[PDB]
Every structure is written in C-alpha cells, then in structure tokens.
Enzyme design. Structure first.
Site, mmCIF file in Angstrom:
data_model
loop_
_atom_site.group_PDB
_atom_site.id
_atom_site.type_symbol
_atom_site.label_atom_id
_atom_site.label_comp_id
_atom_site.label_asym_id
_atom_site.label_seq_id
_atom_site.Cartn_x
_atom_site.Cartn_y
_atom_site.Cartn_z
ATOM 1 N N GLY A 105 40.088 47.889 34.324
ATOM 2 C CA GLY A 105 41.502 48.196 34.235
ATOM 3 C C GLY A 105 42.306 47.546 35.342
ATOM 4 N N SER A 106 43.252 48.312 35.890
ATOM 5 C CA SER A 106 44.201 47.761 36.849
ATOM 6 C C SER A 106 43.549 47.351 38.161
ATOM 7 C CB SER A 106 45.314 48.772 37.124
ATOM 8 O OG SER A 106 46.040 49.057 35.943
ATOM 9 N N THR A 107 42.316 47.787 38.436
ATOM 10 C CA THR A 107 41.684 47.396 39.695
ATOM 11 C C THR A 107 41.410 45.899 39.782
ATOM 12 O OG1 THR A 107 39.482 48.002 38.813
ATOM 13 C CG2 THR A 107 40.631 49.651 40.190
ATOM 14 N N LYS B 254 43.768 43.679 38.374
ATOM 15 C CA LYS B 254 45.059 43.000 38.441
ATOM 16 C C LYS B 254 45.241 42.192 39.720
ATOM 17 C CE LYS B 254 47.956 45.978 35.460
ATOM 18 N NZ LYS B 254 46.977 46.925 34.862
#
Length: 505
Positions: free
Chosen positions: A243-245, A247
């Site tokens: 997920g966003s980790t 980005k």
C-alpha cells in the site's frame, strides 16, 4: 562377549545474540534406557522404578512385558543429571543411563521464530537452528561397549573417534532490542484486540537485523499443544500488498526522472480519478491540490497515480526492484517467502496506477524494512544479515544521495508536519516514516496496519517496520504508529545514539 558400535554426541554450538547473550545452549541431560531381558529378572523392583519415572504401575509393567524380547527400550529421555543419577541409585537390574545434550532457550518466546528449535535428537528443525544446522551440529564421536548373551553391557571398552563440537554462532539480533520490540508489539495487539503482527528493526548501515519479533509466539522450551498459527515467522512468510508504504519509492522514481521537483503541484480534486472501468479513490477527499510532500502526507492515490502516468511505470518498477521489494533477501531462512513484483513489457494505465500506490506487488515485512534501510542509508542498499557482521558491507547505490535526501525530508514532514502522523514522533529525535494499510488477497482479503520508518533524520541508524493484523478496536490505519515511536525511542537509547531533536525529551 559381544560388541556394539554406538555413537558419541557432539556439543551443539552455542547461539548468542550480537553481544554474546545466550539464545540457545546445549545442556547435559540424562536419558534412561532398559534391557527388558534384565528388567524381567527384577520384577519386584518395577513399582519403585515406575513411580520414580512418574508412570502407572500396571501400565509400566505392561510396557516391559510387551517388550521382553528386546534388549533396548527407552524409559525416559532428557532428565536433569540429578534425576538420572537418582534413578540409577535405585540399582534396578537392567536400567542404564546415557548422557545426551538438550537445547535450552534462555529467552523463550521472545526470540522463538528467529532462533527456531531442535529435535529430541538435537537436530535443527526450525529457524536459525535449521539453517545453520551444519555449522552448529559438529561431528559425533564413536564409542565401543561389550555385551553378553542377555544383552547386559559389561564394560565400556574404549573410545573410537572423538566427537567434535559445533561452532558458536553470533546472531545480528540485539536481545535488549528484541525484548523491547517483543514487549511493545505484544502490548499493542492486546490493546487493539489484534490477531497477529510483526516488528522488524535493522541497522541501515550494516544491514544487520537487530530485532525480529512476531505475535503470536510460543515457548520453544515447552512445545506441548503447539498451534500452527503460533509457529509462523510472519516477518518472513506473511506476504501483503504494502500500500502507501511504497509511495515514497514512487516519489523517488519521480524525483529521479528529471520531470518533478518537490514544489510541483498536482490537482487531486475531487479525490477520484477514472481510468477505463476503474476508479482510483483517495481517503482524504479533503484536498483539491497537493504538492509532492502533501501527496505523501495525505497518501493521495490520485496524486501518485497522476505522477505515475507522467513518468511511466517502468521508472517506478525499477526503484522498487532495486530496493528489494519482492526480491530474494538472500537470507536463506527456512520457509522465507519472496513475494511478487511482476514486470510488464508494456504497462497499461490501471497496472501503472496500482503499482504506484502499492497494490501491484506483494512483499514481506523484512523486504519492506530492507527497502526503507536503503532510503535511510542515503540511497545505499546493503545486504540483509541475520548474523553479526564485523565490517560495514559494500553496498549498492540504488537511489542517488540527492533524491534519497529529499525523500528522507518528505517522510520527516510526514511525521512532523501538520496533519501528519504525529503519534510516530520519537521524543528527543527527528524520525521519518510513512503509514499504510496492507492487503492480502486470498477467498479472503485481510487488512493490516503498517508503519515503516527510520531514525535519526540527521544520521539515520536504524529502520523499523511495524505490522498489526486487522485491529478490531474500526479506524486502525494509524494503529502501528505509536508502536514505532515507543520502540524507536527505546532502541535509539539502548544503542547510545545521540539525540538530534531537543527539546522533546
């Protein structure tokens, strides 16, 4: 009269943490065995012998009578030296002893998954005990003893080959840090009513894994009634979409492409973006325009996707591959999973976007920590190590120091700037990190709370990943941040790292 050629056990090598604290120690035990042909001649002694062995009188008698034709059965294995000598002192005909070795794990469940355990035959079956079994086991010896027609061992004749002890192994784990990690992760799961979790700490300069803990866990000294869930080394075998980790690695690709600068602005209104039959959605539809730092702070899926269309998925894929996501760690741990970072010759729009916001790949917690250590170490990737290293390894510069420095500063704003994950702040230090919600598609769809970061911002020393599985107590996206803070604060202090954000502690 007769001759038997039995073996001599080797002292299995000691496993320590990086400071020499014992993690697995071979201790003397006494195993009792019987010649039923001799036991059958001293039946009036059986009840006393059965009670000393904690066995029922008639069941013990049945067992001896069923095996009366054999010259060898085990009575009990692994007694302390005292217990064994005490039964020998009963002078029961046909009862003999042999001294063996048996592992004891002084830290118990605190480091169960990393260390693993041995057989009843002292053979490595899980974790480090399995992976380094050749190093640890040494070479047994060879003994000789004579027997009669009834099988009664008369005399130990001589020793044929001398056993050779196994070698000491010093792990990368710092047991002080493992205790802190294990204690805080456990408390965190109980408080959020969570199922499972992992926490990984690594030295970003050396690649050494300073702590690796999972919940649930087990006492390797007492493996009765052991649940399979409890034996999973989730930090290395549980795979999830990060997920966003990840980005921040999309951003690194952007800043390395020559087309983006931190002051650039991306329009994210109205928090959604249509691509064919799919709709990208932002959690915080609060915003209309974000700069590059704000995209990470707000975790804008729309924003990072628009950047990804501009720079192309190949550039993003290359960074994620080079920092180790979905790539072999080289640790060779038993059961370790490698994840998946699939490449494409041509990248369609949907696959481009899902890679950029972290759902186009599958990783482990160890890989995610390794990737954050590359960003923290000024863009230099160093190989992971489960054992203590004696020199700073040769790394690989996979992100230019200028870009790594920029993204470091953005992740520090993620923790410190307004509207950021303030519960991640480490008193006395400047920390940097990024939160996310993981996903393991299976039929199921598990959600995990993630936080990944490093500290201290002035000269990053350690990286950390906190994974908390489906917290039931349900705004759980920011459940892992306070665990990062407490454990990062304790680790920095234990490693005598000088504070760089006074006043805070």
């Amino acid at each position: 009269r007769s001759v038997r050629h039995i073996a001599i056990p080797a002292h299995r090598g000691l496993i320590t943490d990086r400071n020499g604290e014992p993690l697995a120690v071979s201790t003397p035990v006494t195993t009792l065995w019987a010649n039923p042909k001799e036991l059958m001649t001293a039946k009036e002694r059986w009840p006393q012998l059965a009670a000393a062995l904690g066995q029922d009188t008639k069941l013990f008698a049945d067992r001896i009578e069923q095996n009366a034709e054999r010259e060898f059965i085990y009575l009990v294995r692994g007694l302390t030296p005292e217990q064994g000598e005490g039964v020998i002192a009963l002078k029961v005909p046909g009862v003999y002893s042999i001294e063996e070795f048996r592992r004891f794990y002084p830290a118990g469940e605190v480091v169960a998954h990393a260390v693993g355990f041995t057989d009843v035959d002292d053979r490595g079956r899980e974790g480090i005990e399995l992976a380094f079994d050749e190093w640890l086991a040494g070479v047994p010896g060879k003994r000789q003893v004579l027997k009669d027609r009834r099988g009664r061992v008369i005399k130990d004749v001589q020793v044929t080959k001398n056993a050779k002890p196994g070698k000491t192994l010093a792990l990368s784990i710092d047991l002080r840090l493992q205790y802190l990690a294990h204690r805080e992760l456990r408390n965190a799961l109980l408080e959020n009513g969570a199922k499972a979790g992992s926490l990984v700490i690594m030295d970003v300069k050396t690649g050494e894994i300073l702590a690796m803990t999972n919940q649930p866990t087990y006492n390797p000294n007492n493996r009765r009634n052991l649940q399979p869930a409890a034996m999973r080394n989730r930090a290395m075998i549980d795979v999830f979409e990060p997920g966003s980790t990840v980005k921040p690695f999309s951003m690194s690709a952007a800043l390395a492409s020559g087309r983006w600068k931190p002051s650039d602005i991306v329009d994210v209104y109205p928090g959604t973006l249509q691509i064919g039959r799919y709709t990208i959605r932002d959690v915080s539809r609060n915003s209309r325009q974000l700069d590059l730092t704000g995209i990470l702070i707000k975790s804008s899926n729309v924003g990072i996707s628009k950047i990804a269309f501009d720079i192309g998925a190949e550039s993003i894929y290359s960074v994620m591959q080079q920092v180790g996501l979905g790539q072999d760690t080289g640790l060779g741990f038993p059961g370790e999973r490698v994840g998946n970072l699939p490449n494409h010759r041509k990248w369609p729009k949907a696959e481009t976007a899902t890679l950029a916001y972290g759902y186009g790949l599958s990783v482990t917690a160890i890989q995610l920590a390794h990737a954050y250590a590359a960003l923290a170490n000024d863009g230099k990737s160093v190989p992971l190590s489960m054992t203590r290293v004696d020199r700073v390894p040769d790394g690989v510069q996979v992100i230019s120091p200028e870009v790594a420095s920029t993204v470091q500063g953005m992740l520090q704003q993620v923790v410190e700037a307004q509207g950021g994950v303030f519960r991640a702040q480490v008193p006395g230090y400047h920390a940097a990190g990024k939160s996310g919600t993981a996903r393991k598609v299976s039929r199921e769809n598990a959600y995990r709370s993630l936080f990944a970061g490093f500290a201290p911002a002035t000269d990053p020393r350690i990286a950390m990943v906190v994974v908390i599985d489906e917290p039931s107590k349900y705004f759980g996206g920011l459940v892992s941040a306070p665990v990062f803070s407490k454990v990062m604060a304790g680790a920095l202090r234990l490693m005598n790292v000088p504070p760089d954000n006074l006043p805070t502690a």
